[PDB]
Structure 1
C-alpha cells in the first residue's frame, strides 16, 4: 500500500484532471459532463495503478493504446476519495491549480447545477482555465466572457516521500560512459536527472537547495522549453542522492534502475571503475538498464 505522500508526488508527476463538457442530444440542457482524475503509464508499470486502485478502492484500469495502461477515476462518488487524499496530502506543482479547478467543478456537480444552463456556464468558465482550456467548439458555443487566467503555484518540496514519488515519475538514473584521454579511455559518470516544463522553474530550482547539490539546465525545441535538474558529482550522488532513495523507496521499474545504479556506485566507491574488469562489469550493467528503456 503506497505511502500517501509518495502517492501525491507521483500524481504531481503523472496525474491529470479532466473535465468533459460534451454536446449531448439526450441531455436536458444539451450537454453532459464527466469529471475525473487519471494516470497513464507504460504497461510495465501496471502494478502501480493496481496498487493505487487497491489503496484508494476507486478507478477503472484499461489499456491505452498498445503500450500504455490508464487508471481513470470519474465515478462521482469515487471523486470524494480523490478530494480527501489531496486535501490531506496536497499537490505542489502547477497541477495543484488544476486540482483546485477540479474541486470547483465537483462542487457545481454535487449541487446538481450541471443539469441546468447556468451550471454548464460555470463549468465552461472553469474548463477555460484547466489544462489546454476550451475547445474551438466550446469557444463557439460560449463566446461570452471567459478569462483563462489563474494563479501561479509556488510551493516547496514538503518531504522526501513526495520526492520519491515525483522521481518515480520524472526521474532518470543513468551511467554515462565518456570517451576519455584516461588510461582506460572511458570515464564512468553517474547522472541523476529530473525533467520538467519551465512553468515549474521555482520548484525545480528548489531541488538544488533541498538536496544540497546539482544544477539546473534549460533546453529548447521550437517554442517548447523544459528544465532539467542534474547531479553528477560522485560524492553528492553517493552521500546525498543514494541515501534519500534508500530510505524513501521508489515505485515502479525505476526502482530497478536505481538498484543497478547503486551497483555501479559501489564499484566506483572501491575505485573498481578504473580497472578493466570493473569497467567491463559497469558496461554490462549499463546495457541492462538502457536495454529495458
Structure 2
C-alpha cells in the first residue's frame, strides 16, 4: 500500500534522518570508506509504515533496532537517486532541508568517485561537520584543517504526514467545579524543537486556530502547538485529517478522538454515561492501546 508523496515528505520532516558515514578503514585506498543514506526509526508497532514506504520508493532495507524498534535504511548508492528525485519534487520544510542539502552535496562527490581521493574525503568532512551533530571531534582531530531554513507548509497532505509523526490527540479530563467535577477538553497538539519556531507559528495562520505553549525541560526547549476550542477542533482540525488521511497507529488514536468529538457535539459529555464512554475511549488510546 503506497503512501502519498506529500504525506511521505511530511512524515520525513518529522521522523526521517540523513546519514553520512566517514569511517576509518585500513583496507581502504584513502584510509577512509564512506556510506550515505536516509533512515527512519519507529516503534515496532509502526513497522507497517516502513514497509508501505518501502513499497512506495521500491528501495531501502528493514532491520530491527533493539527489541522495541525497527528501521528503514536506504544506503545502496544507486537507490539514493530515488530519495533525491522525490525530495526534489516534494521538498522538506523543516530545518532538515538543510540536512537534505548537505546530503545531495555528499552524493555528488561520491557520484564522481571523488570519495576515493584524499580531497573527496576532505570534502566529505566539510559536508559532515555541518550535518546533523557534525563531525565526531576525532574526525576533527584527524582533519583539523548553518544557514537556517524558513519555508511554509506546502499543503495539508504534508501536515498529515508531519502530524502523523509529531502529532498528539489528547482527551484531557479536568477536575472542574461543574456538576460532574470533570470537564472534557479535546486537545490537538504538534510538538517541535524551537529551531523551527517560525514553521510552528505558521501553523496558527495556516489552520486558522490554535496557539503555541512554550515548552522546556531543564537544559532543553521546544514548542507545542495546541488547539483547545472545540469549535476549531470540530470544524477546522477534524476535517483536515478526514480528507488528508493519517498513517500509522496514530490514525486509530485520531479516530477514537473524533468519537469523543461527536459525543461532545451531541452534548453527551455532560451526562454520566457519556463521561463513562469518553473515559472508556481515553484509556484504550495512546499509550493504553
1:119-147 Cα deviation digits (max 9, x unpaired): 0000000000000001021010011xxxx
Per the alignment, residue 146 of structure 1 pairs with: none
Give unmatched runs, 5+ long, in structure 1: 144-148
Q: What's the counterpart of residue 265 of structure 2?
A: 269
Query: In terms of mean alpha carbon deviation, does 77-86 or 149-158 score higher?
Result: 149-158
CA distance in 2, matches of 1:266, 1:96: 38
| CA distance in structure 2 between the aligned counterparts of 1:151 and 1:223, rounded to whole angstroms | 24
The residue aligned with 2:285 is 289
Aligned 8 A contact 2:253 2:286 in 1: no
Task: Determine the C-alpha separation between the residues in 2 that align with 1:286 and 1:259.
Answer: 11
1:5 aligns with 6
Q: How far off is 1:291 after superposition?
A: 4.3
Instruction: Return the alpha-carbon distance in structure 2 between the equivalents of residues 29 and 84 of structure 1.
Output: 30
What is the rounded CA distance, in whole Å, between the counterparts of 1:57 and 1:34 in structure 2?
20
Selected match of 1:240 from 236, 239, 248: 236
Distance apart, 1:221 and its partner CA: 1.5
Measured in 1, the distance between the counterparts of 2:125 and 2:113 equals 15
Displacement of 1:151 in angstroms is 1.1
The answer to whether the Cα contact below 8 Å between 2:171 and 2:184 also exists between their aligned partners in 1 is: yes
Change (3 A) 1:9 1:238: same
Deviation at 1:223, TM superposition (A): 2.1
Provide, for residues 212-255 of structure 1, a one-character-per-residue CA deviation record: whole Å limited to 9, x for no partner. 00010112112210000000100000000000000000000100
Cα deviation per residue 1:35-74 (whole Å; 9 max; x = unaligned)?
0000000000001000010110100000001111000001
Give the Cα separation in 1 of the matches to 2:53 and 2:256: 26
SS of 1:273's equivalent in the other structure is: coil
4+ long deviations beyond 6 Å: none
- Matched with 2:92 is 91
Instruction: Give unmatched runs, 5+ long, in structure 2.
Output: none
Q: Is contact 2:42-2:71 (8 Å) kept? A: yes
